[PDB]
Design an enzyme around this catalytic site. Structure first.
Site, PDB file in Angstrom:
ATOM      1  N   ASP A 119       0.137  -1.593   0.148  1.00 38.37           N
ATOM      2  CA  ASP A 119      -1.361  -1.749   0.225  1.00 38.37           C
ATOM      3  C   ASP A 119      -1.464  -3.232   1.109  1.00 38.37           C
ATOM      4  OD1 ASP A 119      -1.945   0.271  -1.683  1.00 38.37           O
ATOM      5  OD2 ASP A 119      -2.309  -1.184  -3.170  1.00 38.37           O
TER       6      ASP A 119
HETATM    7  N1  LIG Z   1      -5.316   5.965  -8.908  1.00 40.42           N
HETATM    8  C1  LIG Z   1      -5.204   4.970  -8.391  1.00 40.42           C
HETATM    9  N2  LIG Z   1      -6.445   4.476  -7.867  1.00 40.42           N
HETATM   10  C2  LIG Z   1      -6.361   3.160  -7.335  1.00 40.42           C
HETATM   11  N3  LIG Z   1      -5.298   2.525  -6.932  1.00 40.42           N
HETATM   12  C3  LIG Z   1      -4.231   2.931  -7.792  1.00 40.42           C
HETATM   13  C4  LIG Z   1      -4.077   4.126  -8.392  1.00 40.42           C
HETATM   14  N4  LIG Z   1      -2.921   4.346  -8.916  1.00 40.42           N
HETATM   15  C5  LIG Z   1      -2.033   3.233  -8.335  1.00 40.42           C
HETATM   16  N5  LIG Z   1      -2.994   2.348  -7.781  1.00 40.42           N
HETATM   17  C6  LIG Z   1      -2.464   1.132  -7.196  1.00 40.42           C
HETATM   18  O1  LIG Z   1      -1.457   1.080  -6.468  1.00 40.42           O
HETATM   19  C7  LIG Z   1      -0.704  -0.325  -6.740  1.00 40.42           C
HETATM   20  C8  LIG Z   1       0.621  -0.333  -6.437  1.00 40.42           C
HETATM   21  O2  LIG Z   1       1.079   0.409  -5.184  1.00 40.42           O
HETATM   22  P1  LIG Z   1       2.587   0.529  -5.275  1.00 40.42           P
HETATM   23  O3  LIG Z   1       3.118   1.766  -6.125  1.00 40.42           O
HETATM   24  O4  LIG Z   1       3.535  -1.023  -5.886  1.00 40.42           O
HETATM   25  O5  LIG Z   1       3.218   0.671  -3.874  1.00 40.42           O
HETATM   26  P2  LIG Z   1       2.238   0.992  -2.532  1.00 40.42           P
HETATM   27  O6  LIG Z   1       1.465  -0.425  -2.398  1.00 40.42           O
HETATM   28  O7  LIG Z   1       1.441   2.108  -2.686  1.00 40.42           O
HETATM   29  O8  LIG Z   1       3.665   0.916  -1.722  1.00 40.42           O
HETATM   30  P3  LIG Z   1       4.104   2.122  -0.720  1.00 40.42           P
HETATM   31  O9  LIG Z   1       5.109   2.991  -1.490  1.00 40.42           O
HETATM   32  O10 LIG Z   1       2.894   2.818  -0.044  1.00 40.42           O
HETATM   33  O11 LIG Z   1       4.738   1.306   0.326  1.00 40.42           O
HETATM   34  P4  LIG Z   1       6.360   1.142   0.830  1.00 40.42           P
HETATM   35  O12 LIG Z   1       7.285   0.971  -0.156  1.00 40.42           O
HETATM   36  O13 LIG Z   1       6.831   2.411   2.044  1.00 40.42           O
HETATM   37  O14 LIG Z   1       6.191  -0.369   1.815  1.00 40.42           O
HETATM   38  C9  LIG Z   1       5.292  -0.800   2.648  1.00 40.42           C
HETATM   39  C10 LIG Z   1       5.870  -1.823   3.259  1.00 40.42           C
HETATM   40  O15 LIG Z   1       6.434  -3.012   2.338  1.00 40.42           O
HETATM   41  C11 LIG Z   1       7.478  -3.835   3.045  1.00 40.42           C
HETATM   42  N6  LIG Z   1       8.759  -3.212   2.149  1.00 40.42           N
HETATM   43  C12 LIG Z   1       8.847  -2.174   1.219  1.00 40.42           C
HETATM   44  N7  LIG Z   1       9.934  -2.118   0.472  1.00 40.42           N
HETATM   45  C13 LIG Z   1      11.005  -3.312   1.192  1.00 40.42           C
HETATM   46  C14 LIG Z   1      12.090  -3.546   1.111  1.00 40.42           C
HETATM   47  N8  LIG Z   1      13.211  -3.287   0.318  1.00 40.42           N
HETATM   48  N9  LIG Z   1      12.604  -4.621   1.887  1.00 40.42           N
HETATM   49  C15 LIG Z   1      11.757  -5.367   2.771  1.00 40.42           C
HETATM   50  N10 LIG Z   1      10.632  -4.840   3.060  1.00 40.42           N
HETATM   51  C16 LIG Z   1       9.905  -3.791   2.226  1.00 40.42           C
HETATM   52  C17 LIG Z   1       7.632  -2.848   4.304  1.00 40.42           C
HETATM   53  O16 LIG Z   1       7.225  -3.387   5.525  1.00 40.42           O
HETATM   54  C18 LIG Z   1       7.074  -1.444   4.252  1.00 40.42           C
HETATM   55  O17 LIG Z   1       6.541  -0.857   5.340  1.00 40.42           O
HETATM   56  C19 LIG Z   1      -1.288  -0.881  -8.027  1.00 40.42           C
HETATM   57  O18 LIG Z   1      -1.637  -2.323  -7.564  1.00 40.42           O
HETATM   58  C20 LIG Z   1      -2.305  -0.092  -8.445  1.00 40.42           C
HETATM   59  O19 LIG Z   1      -3.442  -0.639  -8.922  1.00 40.42           O
HETATM   60 MG   LIG Z   2       1.190   3.474  -1.095  1.00 41.09          MG
END
Ligand SMILES: Nc1ncnc2c1ncn2[C@@H]1O[C@H](COP(=O)(O)OP(=O)(O)OP(=O)(O)OP(=O)(O)OC[C@H]2O[C@@H](n3cnc4c(N)ncnc43)[C@H](O)[C@@H]2O)[C@@H](O)[C@H]1O
Ligand SMILES: [Mg+2]
Ligand SMILES: [Cl-]
Length: 335
Positions: free
Chosen positions: A291
């Site tokens: 996000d």
């Molecule tokens: N029905 C619903 N409706 C509305 N909201 C809902 C919902 N269900 C759940 N939610 C919301 O979802 C949120 C949580 O999301 P999360 O599940 O925490 O993860 P995301 O933000 O969707 O991360 P994503 O999987 O897309 O990205 P990636 O790891 O590739 O990582 C992206 C970037 O992070 C960095 N990164 C990730 N891992 C790393 C690592 N190991 N080391 C270095 N950088 C890293 C990199 O730059 C990478 O490109 C909660 O706040 C919740 O409220």
């Molecule tokens: Mg996501």
């Protein structure tokens, strides 16, 4: 820059976050490393997290998170407007206050019948499992967007962002906004959000895709989409190219597909090329990194920077959010 350049539509949710073990997951028929919508049987989990696992309250919802990160970077309040539905309750004031403090112009619809939605965020080892109880976020209606004030906000926006999550609640609103955007040459952007989105709403996805200028998603969502669309591949570069090449209503802007891969390179695919570009990330020795990546991207997009700068800001922002969590918003963005 001026007020209301970006409008986001999504589900404003309060995250309830805790460290738990597998027996809790088993109790609620949850898988590690997954995101689901709450059913009746999941409902007792929220109080149990609060009462017995010392759960933390964190302002969440995908699009809300992204707009808060974008505002934090912009340092110019009211540049982004958020639409979604909350209850009339304590949970809604936590969301309101946090998002308004960060600089979002929140334009919440109010449900008097449902409480504010929440999302269980269960941490087990290095895995996360999410269970979203949408509740008042599901009470969103197209009519909220039809008030005089809210239609002036749609008319004045230059950029639109919607999560696949919002399809659960009002696909009809997301599509209506996407068609108006294409027809007026404005950018419409969306996120795959979770594997269940293409699995549950394949045809909706197909119907809105011509109007999508930018699609974000992670590797697991891209593979999930490829299965539903019968691509017969798990190769992310190939999947990105196929999505990018889909028929597009506003032919004057070539579709961009951006695929995050955790600690591995962010991938950029542009329609009309056969060469996927990569943006390496420094592997970090957490909630909403994806996000935050989008918030960083949108902060630069609004300042008319090129895509490579938008993506580098995304990676920078995600890495800040992973470090400092909510505290990041108190700092000064130094990108
Ligand atoms: N029905 C619903 N409706 C509305 N909201 C809902 C919902 N269900 C759940 N939610 C919301 O979802 C949120 C949580 O999301 P999360 O599940 O925490 O993860 P995301 O933000 O969707 O991360 P994503 O999987 O897309 O990205 P990636 O790891 O590739 O990582 C992206 C970037 O992070 C960095 N990164 C990730 N891992 C790393 C690592 N190991 N080391 C270095 N950088 C890293 C990199 O730059 C990478 O490109 C909660 O706040 C919740 O409220
Ligand atoms: Mg996501
Ligand atoms: Cl959302």
């Amino acid at each position: 820059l001026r007020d209301g350049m970006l409008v986001g539509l999504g589900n404003p949710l309060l995250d309830i976050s805790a460290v738990v073990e597998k027996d809790l997951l088993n109790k609620y028929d949850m898988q590690p490393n997954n995101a689901i919508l709450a059913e009746e049987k999941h409902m007792p989990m929220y109080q149990e997290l609060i009462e017995k696992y010392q759960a933390e309250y964190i302002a969440g919802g995908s699009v809300q998170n992204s707009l808060r990160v974008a505002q934090w970077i912009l340092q110019r309040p009211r540049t982004a407007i958020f639409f979604g539905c909350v209850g009339q309750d304590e949970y809604a004031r936590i969301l309101e206050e946090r998002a308004t403090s960060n600089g979002v112009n929140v334009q919440y619809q109010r449900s008097a019948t449902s409480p504010t939605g929440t999302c269980a965020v269960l941490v087990t080892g290095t895995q996360r499992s999410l269970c979203a109880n949408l509740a008042a976020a599901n009470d969103f209606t197209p009519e909220h967007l039809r008030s005089d004030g809210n239609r002036a906000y749609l008319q004045g926006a230059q950029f639109f962002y919607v999560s696949g999550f919002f399809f659960t609640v009002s696909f009809e609103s997301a599509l209506s906004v996407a068609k108006e955007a294409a027809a007026t040459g404005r950018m419409f952007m969306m996120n795959l959000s979770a594997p269940f989105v293409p699995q549950f709403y394949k045809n909706n996805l197909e119907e809105i895709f011509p109007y999508v200028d930018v699609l974000f998603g992670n590797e697991t969502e891209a593979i999930a989409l490829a299965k539903e669309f019968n691509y017969g591949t798990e190769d992310l570069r190939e999947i990105g190219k196929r999505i990018a090449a889909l028929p597009k209503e506003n032919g004057k802007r070539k579709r961009i597909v951006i695929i995050t891969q955790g600690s591995d390179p962010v991938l950029l695919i542009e329609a009309g090329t056969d060469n996927v570009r990569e943006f390496p990330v420094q592997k970090l020795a957490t909630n909403g990194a994806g996000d935050a990546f989008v918030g960083g991207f949108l902060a630069q997009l609004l300042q008319s920077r090129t895509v490579d700068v938008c993506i580098k800001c995304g990676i920078w922002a995600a890495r800040e959010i992973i470090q400092r969590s909510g505290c990041t918003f108190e700092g000064e963005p130094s990108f």
